[PDB]
Every structure is written in C-alpha cells, then in structure tokens.
Amino acid sequence: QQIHKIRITLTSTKVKQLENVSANIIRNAAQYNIVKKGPVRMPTKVLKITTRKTPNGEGSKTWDAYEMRIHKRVIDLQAPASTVKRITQITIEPGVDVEVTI
Amino acid sequence: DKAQHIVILDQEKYDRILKDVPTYKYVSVSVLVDRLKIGGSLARVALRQLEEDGIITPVLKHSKQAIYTRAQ
Amino acid sequence: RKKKVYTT
Amino acid sequence: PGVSVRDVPAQDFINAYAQFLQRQGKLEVPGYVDIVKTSAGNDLPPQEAETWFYKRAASIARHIYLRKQVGVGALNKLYGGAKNRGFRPHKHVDASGSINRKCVQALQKIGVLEISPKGGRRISENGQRDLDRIAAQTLEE
Amino acid sequence: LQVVELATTIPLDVQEAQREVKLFNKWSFEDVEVKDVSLVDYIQIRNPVFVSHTAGKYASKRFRKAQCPIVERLTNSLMMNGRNNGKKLKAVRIVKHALEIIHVLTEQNPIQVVVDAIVNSGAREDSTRIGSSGTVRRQAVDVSPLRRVNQAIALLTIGAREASFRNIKTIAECLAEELINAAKGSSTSYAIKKKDELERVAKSNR
Amino acid sequence: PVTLAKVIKVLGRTGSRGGVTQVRVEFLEDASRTIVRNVKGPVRENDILCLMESEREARRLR
Amino acid sequence: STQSVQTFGKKKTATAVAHVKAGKGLIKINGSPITLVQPEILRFKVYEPLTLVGLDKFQGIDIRVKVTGGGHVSQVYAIRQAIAKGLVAYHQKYVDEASKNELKKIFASYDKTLLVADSRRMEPKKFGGRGARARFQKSY
Amino acid sequence: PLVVQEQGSFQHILRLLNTNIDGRIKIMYALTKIRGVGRRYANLVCKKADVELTKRAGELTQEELERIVTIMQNPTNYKIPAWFLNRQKDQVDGKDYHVLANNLESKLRDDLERLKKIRSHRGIRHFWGLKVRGQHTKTTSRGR
Amino acid sequence: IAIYAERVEERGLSAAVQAEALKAKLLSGLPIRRAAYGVLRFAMGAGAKGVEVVISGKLRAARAKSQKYADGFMIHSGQPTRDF
Amino acid sequence: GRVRTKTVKRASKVLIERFYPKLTLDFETNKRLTSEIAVIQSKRLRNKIAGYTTHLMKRIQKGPVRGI
RNA sequence: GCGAUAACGAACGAGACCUUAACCUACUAAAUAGUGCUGCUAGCAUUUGCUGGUAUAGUCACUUCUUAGAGGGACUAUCGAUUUCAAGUCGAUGGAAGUUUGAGGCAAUAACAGGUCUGUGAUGCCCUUAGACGUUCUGGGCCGCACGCGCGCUACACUGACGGAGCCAGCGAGUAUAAGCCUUGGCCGAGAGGUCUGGGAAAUCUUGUGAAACUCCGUCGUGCUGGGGAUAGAGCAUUGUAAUUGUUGCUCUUCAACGAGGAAUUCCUAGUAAGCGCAAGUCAUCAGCUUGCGUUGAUUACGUCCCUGCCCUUUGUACACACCG
Ligand SMILES: [Mg+2]
Ligand SMILES: [Mg+2]
Ligand SMILES: [Mg+2]
Ligand SMILES: [Mg+2]
Ligand SMILES: [Mg+2]
Ligand SMILES: [Mg+2]
Ligand SMILES: [Mg+2]
Ligand SMILES: [Mg+2]
Ligand SMILES: [Mg+2]
Ligand SMILES: [Mg+2]
Ligand SMILES: [Mg+2]
Ligand SMILES: [Mg+2]
Ligand SMILES: [Mg+2]
Ligand SMILES: [Mg+2]
Ligand SMILES: [Mg+2]
Ligand SMILES: [Mg+2]
Ligand SMILES: [Mg+2]
Ligand SMILES: [Mg+2]
Ligand SMILES: [Mg+2]
Ligand SMILES: [Mg+2]
Ligand SMILES: [Mg+2]
Numbered sequence A: 001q002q003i004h005k006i007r008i009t010l011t012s013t014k015v016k017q018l019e020n021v022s023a024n025i026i027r028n029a030a031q032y033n034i035v036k037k038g039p040v041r042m043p044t045k046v047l048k049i050t051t052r053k054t055p056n057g058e059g060s061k062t063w064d065a066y067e068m069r070i071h072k073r074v075i076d077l078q079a080p081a082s083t084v085k086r087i088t089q090i091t092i093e094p095g096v097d098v099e100v101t102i
Numbered sequence B: 001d002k003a004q005h006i007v008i009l010d011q012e013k014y015d016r017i018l019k020d021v022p023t024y025k026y027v028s029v030s031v032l033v034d035r036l037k038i039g040g041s042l043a044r045v046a047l048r049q050l051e052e053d054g055i056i057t058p059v060l061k062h063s064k065q066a067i068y069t070r071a072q
Numbered sequence C: 001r002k003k004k005v006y007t008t
Numbered sequence D: 001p002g003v004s005v006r007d008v009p010a011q012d013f014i015n016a017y018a019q020f021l022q023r024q025g026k027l028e029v030p031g032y033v034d035i036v037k038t039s040a041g042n043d044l045p046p047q048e049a050e051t052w053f054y055k056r057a058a059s060i061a062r063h064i065y066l067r068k069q070v071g072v073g074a075l076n077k078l079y080g081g082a083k084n085r086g087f088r089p090h091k092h093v094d095a096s097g098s099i100n101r102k103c104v105q106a107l108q109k110i111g112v113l114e115i116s117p118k119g120g121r122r123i124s125e126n127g128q129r130d131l132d133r134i135a136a137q138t139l140e141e
Numbered sequence E: 001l002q003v004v005e006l007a008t009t010i011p012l013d014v015q016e017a018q019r020e021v022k023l024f025n026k027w028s029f030e031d032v033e034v035k036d037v038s039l040v041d042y043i044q045i046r047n048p049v050f051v052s053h054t055a056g057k058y059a060s061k062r063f064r065k066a067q068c069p070i071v072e073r074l075t076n077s078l079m080m081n082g083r084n085n086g087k088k089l090k091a092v093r094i095v096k097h098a099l100e101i102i103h104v105l106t107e108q109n110p111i112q113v114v115v116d117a118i119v120n121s122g123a124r125e126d127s128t129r130i131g132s133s134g135t136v137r138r139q140a141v142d143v144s145p146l147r148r149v150n151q152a153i154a155l156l157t158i159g160a161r162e163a164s165f166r167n168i169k170t171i172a173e174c175l176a177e178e179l180i181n182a183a184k185g186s187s188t189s190y191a192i193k194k195k196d197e198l199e200r201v202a203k204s205n206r
Numbered sequence F: 001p002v003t004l005a006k007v008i009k010v011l012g013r014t015g016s017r018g019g020v021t022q023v024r025v026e027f028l029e030d031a032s033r034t035i036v037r038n039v040k041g042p043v044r045e046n047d048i049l050c051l052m053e054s055e056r057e058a059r060r061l062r
Numbered sequence G: 001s002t003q004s005v006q007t008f009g010k011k012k013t014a015t016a017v018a019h020v021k022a023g024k025g026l027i028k029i030n031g032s033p034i035t036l037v038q039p040e041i042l043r044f045k046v047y048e049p050l051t052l053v054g055l056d057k058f059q060g061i062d063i064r065v066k067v068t069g070g071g072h073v074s075q076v077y078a079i080r081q082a083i084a085k086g087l088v089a090y091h092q093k094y095v096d097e098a099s100k101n102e103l104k105k106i107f108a109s110y111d112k113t114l115l116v117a118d119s120r121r122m123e124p125k126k127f128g129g130r131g132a133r134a135r136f137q138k139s140y
Numbered sequence H: 001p002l003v004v005q006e007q008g009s010f011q012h013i014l015r016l017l018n019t020n021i022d023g024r025i026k027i028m029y030a031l032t033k034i035r036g037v038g039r040r041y042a043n044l045v046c047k048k049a050d051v052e053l054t055k056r057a058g059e060l061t062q063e064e065l066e067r068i069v070t071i072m073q074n075p076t077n078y079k080i081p082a083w084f085l086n087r088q089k090d091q092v093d094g095k096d097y098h099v100l101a102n103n104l105e106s107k108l109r110d111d112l113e114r115l116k117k118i119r120s121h122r123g124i125r126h127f128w129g130l131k132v133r134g135q136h137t138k139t140t141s142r143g144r
Numbered sequence I: 001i002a003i004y005a006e007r008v009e010e011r012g013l014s015a016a017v018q019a020e021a022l023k024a025k026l027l028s029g030l031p032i033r034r035a036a037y038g039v040l041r042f043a044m045g046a047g048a049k050g051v052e053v054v055i056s057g058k059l060r061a062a063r064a065k066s067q068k069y070a071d072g073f074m075i076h077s078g079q080p081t082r083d084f
Numbered sequence J: 001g002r003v004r005t006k007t008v009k010r011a012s013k014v015l016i017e018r019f020y021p022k023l024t025l026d027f028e029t030n031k032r033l034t035s036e037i038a039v040i041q042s043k044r045l046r047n048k049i050a051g052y053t054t055h056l057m058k059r060i061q062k063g064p065v066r067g068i
Numbered sequence K: 001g002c003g004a005u006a007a008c009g010a011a012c013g014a015g016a017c018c019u020u021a022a023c024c025u026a027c028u029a030a031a032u033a034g035u036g037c038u039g040c041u042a043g044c045a046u047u048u049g050c051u052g053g054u055a056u057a058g059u060c061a062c063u064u065c066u067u068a069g070a071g072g073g074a075c076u077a078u079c080g081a082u083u084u085c086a087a088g089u090c091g092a093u094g095g096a097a098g099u100u101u102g103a104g105g106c107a108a109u110a111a112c113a114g115g116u117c118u119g120u121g122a123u124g125c126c127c128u129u130a131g132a133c134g135u136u137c138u139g140g141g142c143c144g145c146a147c148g149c150g151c152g153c154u155a156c157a158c159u160g161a162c163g164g165a166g167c168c169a170g171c172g173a174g175u176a177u178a179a180g181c182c183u184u185g186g187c188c189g190a191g192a193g194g195u196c197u198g199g200g201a202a203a204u205c206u207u208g209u210g211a212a213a214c215u216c217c218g219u220c221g222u223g224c225u226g227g228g229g230a231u232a233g234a235g236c237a238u239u240g241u242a243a244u245u246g247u248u249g250c251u252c253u254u255c256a257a258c259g260a261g262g263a264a265u266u267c268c269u270a271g272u273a274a275g276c277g278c279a280a281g282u283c284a285u286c287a288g289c290u291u292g293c294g295u296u297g298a299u300u301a302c303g304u305c306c307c308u309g310c311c312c313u314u315u316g317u318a319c320a321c322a323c324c325g
C-alpha cells in the first residue's frame, strides 16, 4: 500500500469552482513531481424538466423548460494514498463533491 | 370495371405479339398492356423472354420500370 | 335538493 | 491483390451465397419454414417459399462477417420493420426469434460461425475462409 | 482516350467523364437551345451537373431559384401531394427514367425536349384580378420571365401527376408523354391547354 | 406578332394586394417608344419579357 | 512514418473522417469500394471529386474514410467533402501550394459543399405546434 | 420460366364449397373469395397441396382442385398448426376446427345465441347491434 | 451537522428581511402608507440602486386592490435581473 | 434590418471627439484600440461600437459629420 | 435611427443581456472518445498488398474526427449602385456564419370581476362536523348513446401494396434487502411471450438504441384488388389483488364506410412546410396525446392594405361603474 494509480471524480453544477479545484490540484501536482492524467471533461448532462405554466388548466398552452447542468470530471494521479487525500482537503469546495476510487 | 384484360395467352395472341411488338418505337409494361390488351403480369414475363430471344434490346433495367426498344 | 336520506 | 466480402455488392453477393447454400443442401432447415412469417409485424409469409430460409441465412452470415459479437436479439431488430397497426401510427417491431435463432444455430452447424467470448456469435476460423471464396466466384462475370 | 486505372478499380464507362459532364452519363448539355431569347437568363443550363440533386441553398435570397439547375427544379416539383414530400431519391428516379423514354421517342436530346416543353408551356400574359373588395373587375397584365418559367414546371408536373393516377402507365412514362406533347406544342397535352387558356383570357381583357 | 421589351426601371408595387409591379420597358430592336407596363411575376431590371400587344400604356392599378 | 494527412467532412449529423494516406490509390468507404455505393441514383455525387480533377491525381495517394452519424443521403455529402478536403490538405503539406490552389479552384467553381460544410441545422421545435414553425390547427 | 400457351384447358368459373370462384384470379387470392379462407390460410393449403402459386385458378386441373378442398376440410391432417386454425378449442367437443363457407355462419350464429341464452353482457350488446368490446359509442358509429 | 447563526451585514439590501419586517408592521395595524414608505427609505438608505413594493389584498373594503411604490432606478428585462 | 441602436451610436461618437488622432479607418486596429479606451461589458458590443466608429471615420474623411 | 424642430438632455421597455446550434489541423488535456503504428493474430491474391479480431500493460505516438474551458472569429467587412448623399436598402467578393447569423429565455406603465379556494398544513366568510359533506372498505360510474361540434390518426392507391434484401440519426432514461430500474447474451416459443446468467447508479452496459420513411430486386396489374382494416367469432400470453363494459400484445377467420370530399375554414417562407419514425412525461398495464429529437426534404412571396385584427394621428361624444355606458 504505497504509490497507486488513483482516481478522483469531480461533479458539480457550477464550472467556476470546479475548474478552480481542478486547476489547484493540477497546480499542486506540478510543483510536487507527481505524474498526472487530466482533467478529463466528461460530456455535460442537461437534466431538463418541461412543465405547464398554468397552475390551473386555463389559457394558452404555455410551457416552462427548466435545466440542471451536471458537469463531471475525472483526474488520474500516481501517488501514495496518504498524499492524494490531503490534496483533497487543500482544495475542498462546498459546491464540488469528491469521490476517490482505487 | 371495363378493363377485362386477358391474362391467359392463347395461340392467336402469341404470334400476334411477336408480329406487333417489333414494330414499336418503345415497349414497356404499360405499352404492352395498353395496346396488346394483356395483363401486367403477363407483360412482365413476355418482356423478360423477348429480351432473352433477342427481339428486344434493354435500354434500361429496373424493377418498377422496364424501358425497352426495338432491336432492328 | 340532495339531502342524505337513510334507508336502514 | 485479394478479394474480400466488402469488395462485392451486398445485394447480389447474398443471392450467390444463397444459391450455393441451397445446392450444397447440408444446411438443416426446420420443419415450420413453409408455414411461418418472418416477423410478427409482417402479415404474410415470404413469397420465395423454397429459398427464403437459405437467403436469410446468407444475409445473416454476411452481416455477422462485418461485425463483432452480434447477438440473436439484435438480429430480430435488424430484420424487423414497421408494423401495420390499423388506425394507430406505424411502429418498428422486431422479427421472429426462432427463425433467427435457428438460422444462427443452423449456420453454427454448417461451420461458418461460433459462439464468441463475451457474448454474441463470432465468425469461425473457416467462416472467413469460405465467405471470401464465394466473393471471388461472384465478380468474374 | 486516356484509360487510367487506380488501385481501387474504377469502371471503364464511368471513366468516360473526365471528358464531359453528361446528365446520367448519357445527356450532354453542349447541344441544348433555350429557343426563346426572353428566358435564356432564367433557364440555367450553363453549369452542367451529373445528377439532378445538389442540396443547395436556393431559398435564402429572392432570385436564387433562377440559378438552380432546370432539371433539379423539375424533380423538386414532382415530390408533391403530402405522401411524396421529401422523397427526392424517388423523384430523381422518375426524371432519370423519363429522360430515357424521351430519348427512345423522337430520338432527340432528352434535355433539349425539356427546355422546349418549358418555354412552350408558360403563359406570356395572365389576367390578374384587381377586384375592389368583391366586385368582378378583371384586368390583363404581362407575365414576368421567372413566373413564366416556374409556372411551366408547376403545370407540367401537375398534368403528369394526374395522368398517372389510377392508370397502368407509370409516372416516369406519364411524364414522358406530358413532356413530349408539350415540347412540340400539341394542344392535346395538359399545361398547353392551360397556357392557351390563360393567354386566351388575357386577350379578352384589353 | 409578339414584341420583346427589355425592362429598364422598376417603378413600384401597384394593385390592391401589391401583386403587380409597374415597370419601364425598352424594346430590344428600335431602342425607343419606351412604355410603362404592369407585370405579374417577380421582376428585376434587365428582364427580357415579350408583349402580345405593344400599343398600350399602363397607369396605376386598383 | 510516411506522408499522411487526416481530415473530415460533415453534413447535418453525418461526419466522414477521411484518412488520405499516400500509396497506389486505394479509396474505400468503411472498408468497401466506392463502386458499391448503396444509393445508385446518387452514385455520381461521390464520383464528382474524382472526375473533376482527373483520376491521375490519385495515383500516389490512398484514401480510407470512416463515415458515421447522420442519414443515408447526409452521409454521401459528408464523404465527398472529406475526399475533396483531404486531397487539398495533402497538397498544401507535401506538394507546392501552386498545385493546391489549382485543385481548390476547380472544386469551388463546381460546388461549394465539396470543401465548405453546409451550416444548416434543424430548427428546434416550439410548443403550441407539431413543428418548428407549424402550429396546431386553430378553431373558433 | 417463359410464356406458354394453352387452349380449352382454362376454366373461367370454378365452384368450390358451394361458392363461385373467378378462374382468372391467382390461386392464392382466388380462394380468399371463399368465406372463412383468408390470404394467410390460402397460402398454406396451396403449399401443402404442392400447387405452385404461380398458377391461375382456371389453370388447375380437377386432380388439384379436389386435393385442395380435402386439405381445407382436414387441416390438422396436413401438418397445419392448431394455432393457425379458425375455430380452435371448440366449445362442445374441445377439438381444434376450421369452419368453412357455409359452416362458418352457422357456428358463428350458434355462438350468438349461446351468448344470448345465458344473457351475458357481451351477448346482450350483440343483440342491440352495439359494440361489445368496450368501445365508446357516444360520438362514433352513427350510421345505419 | 453544525448550525451557525450569522447576522446579515446590510439588512436594508435584503428583500427577505424587508418583506418580513413589513408583515410584522402590517399585522400590528400600522397604516399601509406609513409601512410601505418605511421599506422604500430603508432599502435606499442601505444603498440599493432601486426598489419597488407591491401590496395586494383586501383592507376593510370588500373589493381588493394593489398599490405599487417605486423609487430610483429599476431594470426589468434580461439576465441582469437575475444578477443584481 | 441592421439599424444600430443608441447605446452604440452615441458611445462611438464620444470616442471620435476624444480619441480621433489614435483612431483609423481599419476595423481590426480600431477594435483593439477600444478595448483599452473603453470598459465594454460584452465582446459583441465591442465589435459593434468599433464597427460604427469605423463607418464614421470613413465618413469624416469625405466631409464634416453631424454630432462630432 | 436619420432628420425636421420650443425644445435640450435622459430613464423603463426595445436593443443590449442569457441559453442553445453552426467555425477553430490555434492552446488544454483525455484506458468511460477516437486514430495510426506496434506486439499477437485471422481470411483473399502471394509483391511488400486488401479486409478483420484482439490490445485496461505496447507501462506506445497523436488530438483531426468525440467531449468541454479559456479564448479567437461577424462588425453588414471591402467594392458597386440608389438615398435629403443621412439613417438605411439592394447586389456582388471573401467567409462556417452577411434573413437581428438560425432559434429561443427574460421582458415596461398601468388593467380584466379572464381561470383556478379541484396544487398547496395559501386563505376571509358561509355550510357540514359522528346517521359527517371528514376518513376508510366493497361494488359500480366518470367509457354509459336517436344526435350537433372541436383537436387528431388511418386511408381512399401503381410517386402504391405486400415478400425478401440493403441499412443510416439525434434529444434522452436507467436499481440494492429492494418491494425492485435499463436490460445485452444464451436457450425454448410461429408469434406474443418464457427461462438462465452477466453488465450498468452509467461517454464504460442496455446502445452504433443496425428506427421508420427510404433504396434494390421480385409478386401484384386498375379490380372495392394483394388499397383500407373497422365490426365480429374462436384461441394463445403479459401487467395487475381484480381485465366482465374485450387494459395491452400475438394467431386464424370476418373484410365494413371510404373510389380524393359542399358551404366554409386552419397552419406555413429554408434544413422551413410536408411526410417518417425515436426518446421523455403520464405509466403495475395501456400513447391514435403532448414536450423534444433527429432521417428524407420541397412549391411559392420576399410584396400589399383588398379581407381580418391591432397600433398611431385627427375627429365626435349627453360615456368616466367608461357601449356590458
Ligand atoms: Mg430495419
Ligand atoms: Mg425489413
Ligand atoms: Mg398503409
Ligand atoms: Mg396503416
Ligand atoms: Mg434594459
Ligand atoms: Mg430582450
Ligand atoms: Mg433598456
Ligand atoms: Mg484500453
Ligand atoms: Mg492490428
Ligand atoms: Mg435572437
Ligand atoms: Mg368570471
Ligand atoms: Mg380546498
Ligand atoms: Mg383544500
Ligand atoms: Mg396537484
Ligand atoms: Mg360516512
Ligand atoms: Mg372524461
Ligand atoms: Mg359502460
Ligand atoms: Mg390543440
Ligand atoms: Mg400509375
Ligand atoms: Mg417494401
Ligand atoms: Mg453509448
């Protein structure tokens, strides 16, 4: 249990904090001589819900079209497990959630 | 209702076909039906053999359309 | 009009 | 230079492989081929009663040649067509499973295909050998 | 005469084209005559095409249709009556077959006959209506070359469409009969009855 | 006896629905006797359109 | 390696990735000869980029394309664009640019879609009708 | 595989199962005139009788005509599947049957009183001449 | 879970606080005009670019009415309404 | 139509009255100059303001313009 | 907007703005995307070639195709015409894009007795509150059929029906001790459908959703015909406690009006109309419905106030609860 090929999966609704955490981890993986693969932009998922505007059923048939974009990025690191987890706490962000899988 | 096109080929019509089709600028399924009074299915088998017998030259080959001309 | 009427 | 299946038109290659497979006679034909319709969406059985099974097996062999581990469920969708629902709009419906499963099973006992790892049905070591042969005897005219 | 072969072999007959672009490698444009001075700029035969299917953008500006090939304008008008909209590949088949029938008959160049049938089918004066909110007040007016050309294609294909309805004669050879008769100016053909009747009414309004 | 007249000036849309256009025509031969006439279809300048009858002018249409 | 250029042509959704390598002139569609295009009535659309310049231009190069997406007709226009762009792109990189500008002149003078992808895309559908502009029939 | 001629052998009008069949119709579609014989059924009895479908009705000889009416009357005896039959799992004797021209309306009728005799809901609506399969009648089927 | 309570820095710029404050005044029987102008001036005093208050309902009268109280500069259409 | 609005017409003519010597008849040069002269919130309004300023510059060399 | 100007200079709305589609061989990377090479490997002619499989260690190379973030790119750019030489408009050239680049989202000042208390543990008041008008259980009804009307789907055939064969998208969705999701692959079954394993909480698997129109080759041959598939009889499965008033699907049989539709009237200008299917929503089951998506893809204007509706100006008014005066 030392140096491993380690995956960090990043998902969030907003891209600004996602790219800051992504760049900050990449920055810390640069000055630290750790070979890295990423970030990989997964195809963004558009969660769309189309309801009727009318609470009742009177009027012209008008519809809302709500959206919820989900952006997912995965980054591959080659480092021991202790090093990668402390990197996560350095780049902790409320919006972006992190899951680590070996 | 008035069509009553002949579907069985007798001998009087057979040699009349071989005597009339060569003297045509353009023969097709409808041309055979229109003037020889034979049915569409009987026209299609007549065209496929008349080409095999050399009397008729195939201008264009197609399932829905058979364009033929005289070979003389 | 209406008025719940009983039988049993 | 050589000849492959991909170098010959599909429509007249199958008409040639169908002719060989019928004259060879070794393909086992199930007993209901004179009764059944190819798909539940169809309304009539095939018009070429004597030869339709051979031609469909020829089509199945060629289609499997060009791909990797195609299943039998995928074959039903491929040969399926638009069903004639009376007043409701048309819809795509899959073909009959037994006809396709018997063909691939029949093709499996003639030596052209076999069950591939991770699902599907691969083409046999000899399956490539004999299809490419038929292609050569197709284009000489 | 230069019979090249590539590694991907190319048939002999199709190689006979680095020479001239003939429609359906049979129909040359070199020998074609818009036999009317007034429609030369609106019957486009200067740019040869192989197949009457270009998928161009001729509906963006106002007069881009005059730049569309004349055969492609004819095959566009065939796919009508709901069930045929968007079926261009079927429409090209009718045109390809129609030209061969026009070739075996009268032996002329099939696309020359098409040009003759279009110039002879467009009415030169149509009587437009100028009714002031209901009353009948017909007035005779002139016809522009563009509307003259494109109404000819509309009338020629409409007549062929109705002649092939519930008739053993196929649409390709109903179009051939419609085009051949109108090309030679015969009054038996549809779209020549209409053109004369249009120009006849215009004479009854001046 | 049809006469051909090239158009040299598009005056404007006339008629009740605007479907007819006033245009200024000039004859191909004998480049004179310029006449104002009405035309049904879409018209640009320099369009070669023939006249069944020549001896008639045009004015605004209803 | 060798003189290899890779390009692509596009129609509505169809995209034809052209691998114009060099060689004896091998030209295949998804591993199949162009002599076997399925739409016979449209077989001359992919023959146009060949006969316009002359088959002698393809002696030294071999082209292998992989076309996916779109529809039957939309794929034909994607293939002919990948071929036309691939021939031009090879000349710009491995031949003098005088010849590349010559080839580009004949192609553009015949059909813009040989080199320029059509920008038309499907209009989105709007509610209140079955189509982009079409609306449900109204009654009074 | 080529045009052939005949004289005096064609029979313009046929009589099968007390039904008149036009002799110039193709055999597969001529039998569909017999009520109780559809296109799907006529295709199989001709294939079971080794009568190639490329023959018109009048082309057939007497030997073939009797061979067809025998198969239609005994379908199960000619490897005709039970599920392919008109009247399978019969009400009274429980065997698979295929009713034909004159027998069809008799047992179709016998089914109607059998529904009406027990006075079921489906039988009642059949008596009224209304739709029995749950169709709405509020706005459709207003002719007469 | 841990909950922290934090004071809003600029109470005048929060429409939620201003709407809750207005309700606590209207429920005390204070007149609408005196109550409405109490949020118009409180919002602007905090530095808002603009503010508009609409109060709808019924007050002693059987018929219901709505009154708008604008002030300053207000934008209405487009994305900036989602930002500012 | 392509009628420019007032937010682009008046903002462009303030530039000419203020930075005429540094302006020119080339849109590309003008486009870069106005990114360091004005604070434009959106790129599209940048290439509009400069595109109408170029038209005015092209018009000033042919005679006097109204409003500048 | 130009311009005219007792007005000058402004604000909201419009426009700007935001989302999406179309370009980038110019950056940034990608074993959940793709490719060439390379290992290993198959078939066909042997010329070293042409088609493949395999490849999560070849511990390869690359980012064009695929994905998305930072940017760049179009501003009517240049040139011709017209114009008060102004705002502008029409043509070309270049261009991925020159109709606001295409399409949408948001959208002012006031207002309607417009529609909803049948969306709300949103509500004032009135009614009821134990034989309830609360709530629950069983069964029926909301589908009920002499009729009038509206949104639509099939069709009236040959530019077509079938029968084989060819075989191409995009928008999306998907589960656990549940209360059961998407389901390939194999095996049975004519079908509908059944069964055994496995993958996938997902660019990984379903899925290239191998969709339909479409195309080729055949049968049919103007015939209420092989168009059309109502109505009905008999039978086989699925979902569900429960299918009778057939949930739906499948098999055989019956095979009706309809032979292009009067007076009237609707929608629509470019990837648009029209066909043609597919997905998501409702959903245990049922899509002839909507919301989207893509395949094939036109005719005809690019004009006008003649009809119709709305806006502005002038005008009349005994109306202002404003002609429902
Ligand atoms: Mg299919
Ligand atoms: Mg099929
Ligand atoms: Mg149909
Ligand atoms: Mg149907
Ligand atoms: Mg604003
Ligand atoms: Mg806006
Ligand atoms: Mg504003
Ligand atoms: Mg891998
Ligand atoms: Mg390899
Ligand atoms: Mg817009
Ligand atoms: Mg009311
Ligand atoms: Mg309530
Ligand atoms: Mg309530
Ligand atoms: Mg609710
Ligand atoms: Mg109770
Ligand atoms: Mg109801
Ligand atoms: Mg009922
Ligand atoms: Mg509606
Ligand atoms: Mg016909
Ligand atoms: Mg078919
Ligand atoms: Mg996938």
Ligand SMILES: [Mg+2]
Pocket (backbone or CB within 6 Å): K224
């Ligand atoms: Mg019938």
Ligand SMILES: [Mg+2]
Pocket (backbone or CB within 6 Å): K229
């Ligand atoms: Mg039925």
Ligand SMILES: [Mg+2]
Pocket (backbone or CB within 6 Å): none
């Ligand atoms: Mg109308």
Ligand SMILES: [Mg+2]
Pocket (backbone or CB within 6 Å): none
């Ligand atoms: Mg109307």
Ligand SMILES: [Mg+2]
Pocket (backbone or CB within 6 Å): K247, K286
């Ligand atoms: Mg239900």
Ligand SMILES: [Mg+2]
Pocket (backbone or CB within 6 Å): K287
């Ligand atoms: Mg559904």
Ligand SMILES: [Mg+2]
Pocket (backbone or CB within 6 Å): none
């Ligand atoms: Mg007044």
